[PDB]
């Protein structure tokens, strides 16, 4: 049986102070998949942190450049006034059935100096 | 709060490793807790994930019955026992709490379909190396059935 895909760009650049926006698309995915969607930033190194969860709740101590929509569709995540330290790579993950996790393959955002 | 994995390094094809996990500083024995991996230069991997009784461990399609999850409350502790190891296998393996799945079962047990969840606490990661010390031609992979 076909289980939920998540797909995000390979790749998107941007420059300090822009805003960019990292989609995640599923197959085999419904709305509930973007209800439950959380997303991963990972630093060069660094271990990964959750930075948004619930499609679009935002923990505490992650800053409030993170936010993130959803719709029926897709999942989201937007980076406000982005700095030097947004370059990481970002995955988001849900449900790939009611018992299984699957996340994306991952967007490496490149901050460009 | 903390976690620290253990039991990585080298292993021979077809070999076996356990991976343990420490965890600290918040209620262990009522969350559900994940192994996630990630091979080099590549994406984040969902393992699998365990409930506060271990009558639920779940598991990604590509593990075919070769790894098991484990738990032991009171030691605080998280185990990945992994047998028939490939190079499709070799990677970083992260210990992960869900720590979102707490503020709504606060016992860890029910296994509801797609609840809320949230990978809020994760370990440094520790290395998995399944090698012979040959190039990626020397590597084996899954024979397909299961």
């Known amino acids: 049986a076909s289980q939920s895909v998540l797909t995000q760009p390979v790749s998107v650049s941007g420059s300090p102070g822009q805003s960019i926006t990292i989609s995640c698309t599923g197959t085999?995915?419904?709305?509930?998949?973007?209800?439950?969607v959380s997303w991963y930033q990972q630093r060069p190194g660094k271990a990964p942190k959750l930075m948004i969860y619930?499609?679009?709740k935002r923990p505490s101590g992650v800053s409030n450049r993170f936010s993130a929509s959803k719709s029926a569709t897709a999942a989201s995540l937007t980076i406000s006034g982005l700095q030097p330290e947004d370059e990481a790579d970002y995955y988001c993950?849900?449900?790939?059935?009611?018992?299984?996790?699957?996340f994306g393959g991952g967007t490496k955002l490149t901050v460009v100096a | 709060v903390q976690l620290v994995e253990s039991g990585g390094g080298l292993v021979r094809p077809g070999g076996s490793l356990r991976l343990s996990c420490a965890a600290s500083?918040?209620?262990?024995?009522?969350?559900?807790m994940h192994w996630v991996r990630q091979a080099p230069g590549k994406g984040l991997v969902w393992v699998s994930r365990?409930?506060?009784?271990?009558?639920?461990?779940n598991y990604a399609d590509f593990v075919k019955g070769r790894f098991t999850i484990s738990r032991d409350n009171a030691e605080n502790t998280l185990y990945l026992e992994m047998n028939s190891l490939t190079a499709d296998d070799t990677a970083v393996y992260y210990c992960?709490?869900?720590?979102?799945?707490?503020?709504?079962?606060?016992?860890?047990?029910?296994?509801?379909?797609?609840?809320?969840?949230?990978?809020?606490?994760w370990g440094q990661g520790t290395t998995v190396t399944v090698s012979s010390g040959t190039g990626g031609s020397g590597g084996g992979g899954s024979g397909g059935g299961g």
């Open positions: 992960v709490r869900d720590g979102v799945r707490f503020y709504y079962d606060s016992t860890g047990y029910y296994p509801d379909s797609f609840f809320k969840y949230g990978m809020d606490v």
């Open positions: 500083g918040f209620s262990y024995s009522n969350h559900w």
């Open positions: 365990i409930n506060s009784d271990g009558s639920t461990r």
């Open positions: 085999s995915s419904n709305a509930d998949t973007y209800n439950l």
């Open positions: 619930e499609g679009t």
């Open positions: 993950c849900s449900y790939a059935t009611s018992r299984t996790l699957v």
